[PDB]
Design an enzyme around this catalytic site. Structure first.
Site, PDB file in Angstrom:
ATOM      1  N   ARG D  82       0.793  -1.069  -0.123  1.00 31.10           N
ATOM      2  CA  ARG D  82       0.049   0.243  -0.142  1.00 31.10           C
ATOM      3  C   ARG D  82       0.695   1.424   0.037  1.00 31.10           C
ATOM      4  O   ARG D  82       1.844   1.430   0.872  1.00 31.10           O
ATOM      5  CB  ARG D  82      -0.970   0.200   1.204  1.00 31.10           C
ATOM      6  CG  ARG D  82      -2.045  -1.037   1.199  1.00 31.10           C
ATOM      7  CD  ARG D  82      -2.999  -0.990   2.585  1.00 31.10           C
ATOM      8  NE  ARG D  82      -3.961  -1.975   2.347  1.00 31.10           N
ATOM      9  CZ  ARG D  82      -4.620  -2.417   3.617  1.00 31.10           C
ATOM     10  NH1 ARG D  82      -4.442  -1.805   4.662  1.00 31.10           N
ATOM     11  NH2 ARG D  82      -5.585  -3.389   3.205  1.00 31.10           N
ATOM     12  N   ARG D  89       5.305   8.131  -7.321  1.00 35.30           N
ATOM     13  CA  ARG D  89       4.891   7.019  -8.223  1.00 35.30           C
ATOM     14  C   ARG D  89       6.008   6.053  -8.619  1.00 35.30           C
ATOM     15  O   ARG D  89       5.511   4.809  -8.538  1.00 35.30           O
ATOM     16  CB  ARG D  89       4.202   7.565  -9.460  1.00 35.30           C
ATOM     17  CG  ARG D  89       3.570   6.556 -10.211  1.00 35.30           C
ATOM     18  CD  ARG D  89       3.055   7.192 -11.531  1.00 35.30           C
ATOM     19  NE  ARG D  89       3.697   8.145 -12.193  1.00 35.30           N
ATOM     20  CZ  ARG D  89       3.608   9.558 -12.180  1.00 35.30           C
ATOM     21  NH1 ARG D  89       2.364   9.955 -11.478  1.00 35.30           N
ATOM     22  NH2 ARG D  89       4.379  10.336 -12.784  1.00 35.30           N
ATOM     23  N   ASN D 121      -2.119  -2.016  -7.522  1.00 36.38           N
ATOM     24  CA  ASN D 121      -2.291  -0.527  -8.051  1.00 36.38           C
ATOM     25  C   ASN D 121      -0.773  -0.140  -7.814  1.00 36.38           C
ATOM     26  O   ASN D 121      -0.111  -0.496  -7.002  1.00 36.38           O
ATOM     27  CB  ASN D 121      -3.131   0.413  -6.889  1.00 36.38           C
ATOM     28  CG  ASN D 121      -4.624  -0.026  -6.843  1.00 36.38           C
ATOM     29  OD1 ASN D 121      -5.145  -0.218  -5.835  1.00 36.38           O
ATOM     30  ND2 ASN D 121      -5.158  -0.017  -8.190  1.00 36.38           N
ATOM     31  N   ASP D 149     -15.079   0.989 -12.487  1.00 38.16           N
ATOM     32  CA  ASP D 149     -15.416   2.244 -12.690  1.00 38.16           C
ATOM     33  C   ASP D 149     -16.373   2.308 -13.764  1.00 38.16           C
ATOM     34  O   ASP D 149     -17.339   3.098 -13.802  1.00 38.16           O
ATOM     35  CB  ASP D 149     -14.178   3.060 -12.957  1.00 38.16           C
ATOM     36  CG  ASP D 149     -13.628   3.369 -11.486  1.00 38.16           C
ATOM     37  OD1 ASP D 149     -13.918   2.996 -10.298  1.00 38.16           O
ATOM     38  OD2 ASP D 149     -12.360   3.793 -11.341  1.00 38.16           O
ATOM     39  N   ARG D 152     -19.662   1.269 -12.124  1.00 34.84           N
ATOM     40  CA  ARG D 152     -20.414   2.285 -11.356  1.00 34.84           C
ATOM     41  C   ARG D 152     -20.885   3.473 -12.112  1.00 34.84           C
ATOM     42  O   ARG D 152     -21.701   3.996 -11.901  1.00 34.84           O
ATOM     43  CB  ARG D 152     -19.416   2.878 -10.351  1.00 34.84           C
ATOM     44  CG  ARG D 152     -19.611   3.769  -9.271  1.00 34.84           C
ATOM     45  CD  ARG D 152     -20.985   3.245  -8.393  1.00 34.84           C
ATOM     46  NE  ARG D 152     -21.059   4.129  -7.446  1.00 34.84           N
ATOM     47  CZ  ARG D 152     -22.307   4.133  -6.566  1.00 34.84           C
ATOM     48  NH1 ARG D 152     -23.388   3.319  -6.828  1.00 34.84           N
ATOM     49  NH2 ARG D 152     -22.745   4.977  -5.602  1.00 34.84           N
ATOM     50  N   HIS D 176      -6.614   4.005 -14.982  1.00 38.70           N
ATOM     51  CA  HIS D 176      -7.537   3.871 -13.903  1.00 38.70           C
ATOM     52  C   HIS D 176      -7.324   5.038 -13.000  1.00 38.70           C
ATOM     53  O   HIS D 176      -5.911   5.089 -12.549  1.00 38.70           O
ATOM     54  CB  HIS D 176      -7.201   2.434 -13.194  1.00 38.70           C
ATOM     55  CG  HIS D 176      -7.988   2.373 -11.970  1.00 38.70           C
ATOM     56  ND1 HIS D 176      -7.488   1.885 -10.874  1.00 38.70           N
ATOM     57  CD2 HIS D 176      -9.330   2.256 -11.751  1.00 38.70           C
ATOM     58  CE1 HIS D 176      -8.499   1.776  -9.780  1.00 38.70           C
ATOM     59  NE2 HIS D 176      -9.724   2.100 -10.424  1.00 38.70           N
ATOM     60  N   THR D 224      -9.816  -0.354  -0.536  1.00 41.37           N
ATOM     61  CA  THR D 224     -11.300  -1.011  -1.164  1.00 41.37           C
ATOM     62  C   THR D 224     -11.051  -2.497  -1.251  1.00 41.37           C
ATOM     63  O   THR D 224     -10.082  -3.145  -1.328  1.00 41.37           O
ATOM     64  CB  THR D 224     -11.586  -0.814  -2.483  1.00 41.37           C
ATOM     65  OG1 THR D 224     -12.619  -1.358  -3.158  1.00 41.37           O
ATOM     66  CG2 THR D 224     -10.321  -1.011  -3.342  1.00 41.37           C
TER      67      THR D 224
END
Lengths: 305, 306, 299, 308
Positions: D82, D89, D121, D149, D152, D176, D224
């Site tokens: 995480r 980045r 990610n 996404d 949604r 993303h 998430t």
């Protein structure tokens, strides 16, 4: 008409909610807990996943008014025992949490059914019942429902016969002291002593032994109890009158005179416990139930309401 | 590995096909009959509604070659009893039809399981087995599977308790002489003799058999109920469920029966067919009824012209 | 409440009932027809099959009182010149419709009798109900099969092939090619003739009747889908026979299929597609002809 | 029989939500869980088996030994770090690449014919990294990308219009997150473009809501789990069932939309048993192409700084 409130958004509560919404048990969920940011995070995560489904309503708030009009409230909140804390002190600390939760649930959903999942589930079902003021048939605990189901599954696996033909229950106090009702176990109507098809006690020990091993290994249980709670909710919401071993008001069954809750197979429907299945227990099975009830009554007598 | 052939596109056969494809039992179905236009019409009607069910390959033909490689063949072809027709005459008319059907199914699907669903089902399961040359555990009849479901439903209705906790079987000869195994009936593990619930008994079995015949008397046949029954049996086999179903099965060697007949017993069903028979401790009255049915079945079989 | 009444226990009515009960659309069904023995026979056959299912209520009677309190009434009863055929069906419906509305004043009507568009108009007029509460099976089935066959030709799932057939059911129906898309890409733009797919969907529908005498399974499945959309309040879109006046510059009070948003109150809205002049002219041609036939119906 | 075997790498919150989604929705009956935490793996295995009577029959394995993943049709990769406060980045990409250098060779060692679905990610870059590390054909490596996404997005359009999601069509493509591309040119309701809509029941706000609410979940609970688990289960089902359904997933992009960079970004892909069967080629507008090209340009530059 199918609104379910889940109290507690820890591991068990979230597994319950997720099982219910994805298995189509209800499309109207409320979540209550004391941590506002965690609640909103879980709410939004689930709503983002609701994207994959049709008409699912989820709400969450620290305010119990969000739970208004619930057909069922599932309580998973509680505290973990501290090292060297007495059993009574652990029950009292959970009772003090439930003093706050239970009357608020009833205030906003006077017609609700309560399903208690917090451990120790039998005495906390009694406590929640007393605090609720509700009729005895409208308050149950998750009890031995999961263990009974896993029991039948393991019997089925040993026999090479589908679980739908392997019948039987574990009753009494959840955990090591629970009672496998071997006298009622049967395969397609054939009792075990009669089986002539193409020792067993280890199966019960295995089921209650695996349950505690999970907590030592991953710190908690979530998925299995979540699925069990989802099944209990479905039986009530769908008015199934299906039979589930759940913590229930015991006084007056099996010659028990102590006002306690222990698991018995219950017929569950929209009004809650429609009836309890009255099993012709052996004296050995009955005596274990009586011993559990006596010890539980003595702990209950020490609870400060 | 899930292909099902249904022989006969009458009411029973089409209800079986529709049940299986709308409930996800198989995605590979063949329909065989002699009526070429009816086969094509049913095929195209089912295909016209393809967007409303899971993807499925459907074939229909008078040529049995389209049944090749079937895991199960459901045989529903046959005649309907004529007014005053004797049991022997009815059995022989159905046998004449089966003499044509059965060898063609076995030619194209040597490893298939047969499920017989023509009346009288117990004797015609024996006939189909004898004609097929297949192993005894690979030929079953619909038998009392639906009767047993109805039995448990009526117990559930009387007690106010879900059918999933009301357990019991009807065994023996499908029809008026079938045998409710009261000795094995139990509600959530409680025998009837020990039952002590809040919400006589023998009427339930009589209701199952009388209402069954009343259906045939009113519309001329049964279709929807038997179609669902056959779909459930096919599912148990295809999915290797090892679930228990009362089906017409090879009886010699069970319950001290020495007659080579088929009658219903609760069978463990899976991909091999009958995996095992549930051996119920019958009472003397239950056992003697089964024996009497087996004796009478053997006598009727001796009159069949093969 | 989820009670559905099916009027007519012929091939279409029984296929609709069986689809609905087994696909879980409703557990409360009533069946009305004129032949009592056939009625009880079907009732009992279904009840014995419900032994495999959980709490399903089925009723059946020649008396319309058993339809009381239905959320949806599905009308499949009909009779086998085109004006005289419409008149004979109208006479049948003159008896059926007022009784359905008497016992379920809050019901939605789904008309499946052929010819479906004009008989949906007739049912609506006989019913006295609001226009949004009376629909016909229309082109819903043909649109679904149309999308399936497009998907089959392209090797892409049907859930990504979108489009509708609208207008008058059958040979005059209108494939709305201008709205056909694959994952949002219009057909003229696909970088991964067609008219034959529409033709074969209407040609296949009539071939079935010549071969087995009637259609049953496909229309049964279509009716079950429309019932589920209404009962579950899906607001899903279905091409159904619907009140046309005021849409697409139509001034005649006729019914033809348009893609409709269907929910608990019936037709919540009509999808208003930008039609080409050819598509709109065909719709107007059908509406013009329907108005003239309706003008000859004796109510 | 391993005809539908799925391996999930990582039994954190994403991986377990994917496992639970797949087995309770019937996506597969043969699942293997791999991680480095022996006790956690065993505890999750036993917790799922304890609830076996409440789901379809399933074979579940869990081990630190990748041998249990042998013969997998799909491997879902959720293991990863995480992002830390202030972490660049570049740093985050390299920490995840260090983990994938261990995982990916082991997966293809035991399942040479597998498909990879990458879910860690940043998913687009890590799908490229996994493809390079795996040696697999380009159509057999995808990332979860913008699939969730896009769903949604369609759901929000549906809520605005009072029309079921099954008639609200459209995709978010590209990178993303904040820079993803809503393909407004292809959005349509029951075949009607938004500029033609005239129905009873500011449009740009919908895409902003999708990206901002996704970020907010991560800020509030830290991660998430439920939404991405359902998304991954949906992708697994499409592939296992040979559905040829369309999903926006991170995919090999060079040669599409005039992109010359060997990068991965989301496009709507037809998915089946072979992996990516085809890419849906949308007639993108100048603005949509511009955003996609900028993301591809920047991604190529980040890829050049990765240490393999």
């Amino acid at each position: 008409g199918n609104k379910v409130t889940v109290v507690g958004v820890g591991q068990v509560g979230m597994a319950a909610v997720f099982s219910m919404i994805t298995q189509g048990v209800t499309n109207n969920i409320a979540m209550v807990d004391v941590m506002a940011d965690k609640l909103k995070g879980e709410l939004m995560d689930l709503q983002h996943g609701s994207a994959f489904m049709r008409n699912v309503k989820i709400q969450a708030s620290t305010d119990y008014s969000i739970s208004a009009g619930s057909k069922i409230c599932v309580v998973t909140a509680g505290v973990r025992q501290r090292e060297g804390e007495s059993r009574l002190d652990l029950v009292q600390r959970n009772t003090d949490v439930l003093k706050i939760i239970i009357p608020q649930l009833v205030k906003h959903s006077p017609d609700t059914i309560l399903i208690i999942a917090s451990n120790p589930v039998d005495i906390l079902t009694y406590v929640s019942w007393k605090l609720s003021g509700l009729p005895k048939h409208r308050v149950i605990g998750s009890g031995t429902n999961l263990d009974s189901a896993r029991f039948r599954y393991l019997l089925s696996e040993k026999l090479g016969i589908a679980t739908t033909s392997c019948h039987g229950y574990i009753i009494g106090e959840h955990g090591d002291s629970s009672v496998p009702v071997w006298s009622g176990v049967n395969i397609a109507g054939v009792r075990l002593s009669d089986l002539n098809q193409k020792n067993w006690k280890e199966t019960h020990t295995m089921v209650v032994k695996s349950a505690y091993e999970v907590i030592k290994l991953k710190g908690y249980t979530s998925w299995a109890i979540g699925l069990s709670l989802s099944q209990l909710a479905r039986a009530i919401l769908s008015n199934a009158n299906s039979v589930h071993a759940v913590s229930t008001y015991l006084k007056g069954e099996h010659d028990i005179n102590d006002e306690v809750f222990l698991s018995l197979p219950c017929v569950l429907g929209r009004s809650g416990v429609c009836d309890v299945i009255r099993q012709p227990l052996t004296q050995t099975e009955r005596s274990q139930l009586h011993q559990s009830a006596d010890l539980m009554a003595k702990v209950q007598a020490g609870i400060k309401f």
